[PDB]
């Protein structure tokens, strides 16, 4: 949404562009646009969503 995807080698995070404050990639700070066959530079990773743990607690 705002920021960039940064990896310290083995774990992917979202940070704001001007101050390194890392946060886990999640559905509330990244948006989605189609499938990923058109983008060059894609990397596979998990986008953990916050509703699934609450729903799985049921």
């Amino acid at each position: 949404r705002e920021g960039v995807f940064v990896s310290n080698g083995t774990h992917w995070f979202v940070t704001q562009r001007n101050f390194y404050e890392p946060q886990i990639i999640t559905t509330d700070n990244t948006f989605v646009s189609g499938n990923c066959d058109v983008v060059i530079g894609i990397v596979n990773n998990t986008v953990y969503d916050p509703l699934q743990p609450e729903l799985d607690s049921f």
Partner: protein, 50 residues
């Protein structure tokens, strides 16, 4: 000087003008071709037009 891949920087700049960044990545080849041809036009304009 902090370096960013030029594509991601162009995405930054599209966010700057109001267009979302996915528009660049989905259309990166087309945008590259437009920029290259636009630079090519300048050479004709300078060399030929007096």
């Amino acid at each position: 000087a902090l370096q960013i891949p030029f594509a991601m920087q162009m995405a930054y700049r599209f966010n700057g003008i109001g267009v979302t960044q996915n528009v660049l990545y989905e259309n990166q080849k087309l945008i590259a071709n437009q920029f290259n041809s636009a630079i090519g036009k300048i050479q004709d304009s300078l060399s030929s037009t007096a």
